[model samples]
Target: APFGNFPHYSRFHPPEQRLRLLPPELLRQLFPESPENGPILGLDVGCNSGDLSVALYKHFLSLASREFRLLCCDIDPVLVKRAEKECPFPDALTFITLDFMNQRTRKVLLSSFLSQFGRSVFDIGFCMSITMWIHLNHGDHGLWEFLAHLSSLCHYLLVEPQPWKCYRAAARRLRKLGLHDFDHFHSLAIRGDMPNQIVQILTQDHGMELICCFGNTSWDRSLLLFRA
Candidate 1:
């Protein structure tokens, strides 16, 4: 029942059409200041109803020091059409309708997509509640494929956690700024209250701590999962 109600999976169909959800501040953290101008792409995986896409468009105005290009992909055609109609600027965001949830193989698709974007392509790749869906509802093996795809597309990844932890190699990667920046410049824009266990583990081992929480109450933190 809870799974059925999950917004990222049940409502928004990702692996095809993901909504742009991260705030402009979060985007700034994931990406370099780009004080002058450069390409900035905020990718939303498993975007449903395009709520996050529109929100990102609205929020990105403040971060308009550079030209921004936002792309959203999802397997849901209905949601893709909705994005075409409701998304803020047609010129700014491109919505792609492709069913990749049950995709048997993504090597070709991933390669093609990366080629189009080019090497060192996206400034940031956002994977919010999309990962869980890919593992649980879709194929479990798809996780590695998705991770590989993400590695190719992004210089940085802002991963919003879904009850998870990281590997030892991943922990090391979080510290290497040349590979990925994980300093104070990197931050998390939490949606809801994150559990205390996560907070303890992250703060105890990793240098991560509560930068600031939203909603004022204790239930306004996000369980952020990223290189930072």
Candidate 2:
């Protein structure tokens, strides 16, 4: 969960250890039994070494018949390289070099890079411990804008807001960015025993939405899910 300037947490957290916190119970937390089914496109924002993403891969495999496409991303270049080389998932589990914290610039870079990757739309998208560093203050309208932007490419999406204040603080960003209008438009949990970190999901149907979220005392956590 290293969000600040640095070598990042991706370098420290190993892949095998990532799935440990994620149990079968957590799987249903993201995907409620529903009808708007389609392939599952899984995203891991600021994935670091793909810990949460890898956990998701296992979860999806155990839960559904839908095709599970995994995508793991990070703001740090060094981490992306490490993930591509070391993450256990196959090539279909794309490892992208991205800076989710920089919304506009990332749009240009990722749009081009994705050309070499795969489809533009995915059923599932996630942001783990990544959005908090997006800088809600001056000049960085980055977090909320990026979430709105990413939601466009997904039918279902999830994001984590770290602590209590940041959850609502980020809501202000979403309000400022005018993203409160989207499908499954929502915020992180506002209550007790919530993990110091958490994950929230936004699922869309014909473009309007449903959102699901959870909190765990866990530190290395954020959003997750799909589209269609």
Candidate 3:
């Protein structure tokens, strides 16, 4: 269950967050190095059913008349398969299975990705609702490492940080099912200042500037856009 049975809940949670939240001027500046002749390259993590990926594809196309190539990854092959069916741009969008928690496998995957796309070729990356799982499944160290690796591959990152209650709720559910191996999930540090910490790590540690933070608590999420 990659991200804990995503397809089952995809209906419950709609794709309300969008990369189009960025100002038109900022969207235009996404990939400065992108040659006008080529398509805008992008990456999407946790692309459940490919809904968000498709939305971003349309937005990218509208913003820049150029074509777009989006690489979407999810831990669940079944979900990726479903996304492949729903995605309108089959030729331009590719779906792959990725486990961000495994650094060794992650390196291999990224090497292959850059081998095809070339270094620093990815324009923008979307990471939604999956960071908390990485932190809970792995740890703070693993979370930061994963974030750093994700940032290296693209010029921008779209981060959605879950609230402290979300962590507590997940922990409670896991405990009821006899799945309580998460030591870091119980930590006060992660539950305390995750929002600020996330922003600081992307900005101070990785040299990314905060472009914009939009959305509301109704989605139980706020999107933080950062440029590398």
Candidate 4:
């Protein structure tokens, strides 16, 4: 299956379940209020249908006294379209169809978006359950590049990486559907302890620090927070 392209994905993994782990206190700690600071800019990569984006926006609204703006993107145009239509906070949230793996497109789109606020880096970036798909499709090196790129774009990154078993399940599902296997599935060197590997890469290679591990979700994925 394509990354986060599952039909009615929010039904299977509701945004509220993931939001439960991100408490208001933690957010306040991460983004301290300052009158000198501009709007709190956020980027949501691979935001399928914007369910989590919307929920997260609302969550931030509950605690943030400063202005907040979120830019959400996904590879799937259909999902992006749906997200744009259903978005309640059109002024606060912007949805776009983008493939984060595409370097040129990512640069042009994201840079332009950030330029509007006269800022280069975002306050936070969310990558919820997106690493596995990038790894599978783009290989280990691609995954590293993606992480590094994301790290450079934000001061804080929130990543929820799927475990090795989930990769197996994804491959299995693709085969069951009579689709071609992931290009990098069998050859991936970075197997097992995915979260640890990701942390190592982000910390060592990207100069990011592991701020906290928000523990595992109900589906057994780890929500990791990192600061650059």
Candidate 5:
């Protein structure tokens, strides 16, 4: 989450913002419903290059002593292709190219896959460093709707909420595309309380349970873990 000149489309880490490893006992406690006592079925929403997906896969493997099934979702086909081609454990991952919040196509795509699993396809959902962009592009309702849908499809969620500064960065970058009222978007939530609001919506409206919440200094980024 380090801004150090704003790493975008290139750098994947400040290293600290990466998903933390969970101990085996806690991992089991967090997701007791994973198939056959294996590692959880996970999805990395908005995964850029798929490296983080791989990281989570490996992290889960270390903790569970089993292979983790992961799905990587992103809008860009080329990046998704790169992720598929470069993935070392290709058999354990799926790179899906879809605009996750495209109002029209979102439900169609999600329903097709999620329905196969009775509307609950993943046990773990990782949404890192992309909340601001999704929220900025789709607005408040879309953001929460997407989170709620994700809540319905997973047992656990790992999210990194970008703060107001990051929202500002998104505003500046997205303004070039002549998107909706940029300033209005920036003023939507209190600088540090956006994540709390997200947690509230998920828990109150979507039937999710909060597990933990923590923050980082460099970017006002917050990490939240939840159960459903």
Candidate 6:
């Protein structure tokens, strides 16, 4: 298993903790009453076993003035299968196996999904504790491309970026597991103060604005929200 791809990842990290930090008043403020533009669409990247996805679906349902639909994806097929099997709201939530770094697959899958709903972009996107995995696997350039692509597809992006220390710990875990280290782990220059770097890239390079900082998680990861 790669870093952040543990079988029982939600058991350790838990979705409730993340949800607790996101106040309903803040969500209501971020997503105010709007005219019917179809269901409010959400994209949950790197959703692990649909735990957070389901929680988010329910959360949004409570706050949204209109209908809500969420598309949750992960690279792990087994996790996707588990998510699909256990999903309580199959109509409102869809789980799929996706390697978001794959350009063609990402475009086609996401485009088809949005096209069905006649949506140009998602209302909100969630990238919870998944940036470091992407940063470690892909190089610094890849990280930028990932964020840029995400910004293009989403109106608002919520990211929980793992700090630099977490990168060191992830590397150590791989070593202890007797697996080869992440190829770009040592070479990644966009390290230390990762949340700040992400904010800069999303704002400066991607034409996004930092709307809010939901503060840091118990794990010390910052929950940042940006608007495109």
Clashes of 2: 16
| C-alpha lDDT score of every prediction, in listed order | 0.49, 0.51, 0.70, 0.84, 0.66, 0.82
User: Please, what is the TM-score per model?
Assistant: 0.56, 0.57, 0.83, 0.93, 0.78, 0.92
Off by over 4 Å in 4: 61-64, 216-219
1-228: candidate 2 lDDT, tens digit per residue: 224323535465453444444345544455554535544455666666655566567654344543466667776777777767777877457787776655575677556645553657655566555555553321123443555666776656655555545545555656666654421213322233223212222222124253433434444443333333
In terms of lDDT, which candidate is stronger, 1 or 2? 2
Cα error of candidate 2 at position 62, Å: 4.2
Question: Model 6: clashing residue pairs?
Answer: none
- Root mean square deviation (Cα) for candidate 2: 9.1
lDDT (Cα, 0-100) at 159 in candidate 4? 94
Range of the 10 consecutive residues with the lowest summed lDDT in candidate 4: 1-10
lDDT of 4 by residue, 67-103 (tens): 7789998888888889999889999999998989898
Clashing pairs in 4: none
Of the candidates numbered 1 and 3, which has the greater lDDT value? 3
Worst 10 residues of 1 by lDDT: 182-191
Ranking by TM-score: 4, 6, 3, 5, 2, 1
The most accurate candidate by lDDT is: 4
Off by over 4 Å in 5: 1-12, 15-17, 20-26, 33-39, 62-66, 103-120, 176-192, 214-220
- Per model, how many backbone clashes are there? 12, 16, 0, 0, 0, 0
Put down candidate 3 lDDT per residue, 1-228, tens digits, no spaces.
425545734565555444445454545766554465356666787777787667666655344465567788888888888888877887888888777677676577666775664554577778877788778877787778878877787788878877666787777777776777653565535555566678888888888888878765345567888888
Better of 4 and 5 by lDDT: 4
Q: Which residue window of length 10 is worst by lDDT in model 2?
A: 196-205
- Between candidates 4 and 6, name the one with more favorable TM-score: 4
For model 2 the local lDDT of residue 58 reads: 63
Q: How many backbone clashes does candidate 5 have?
A: 0
Worst 10 residues of 6 by lDDT: 58-67
Write candidate 5's Cα lDDT for 10-121 as tens digits: 4645433454434334455565454555555677887677777776666543344544567778877777788888888977788887887665666666556555445446
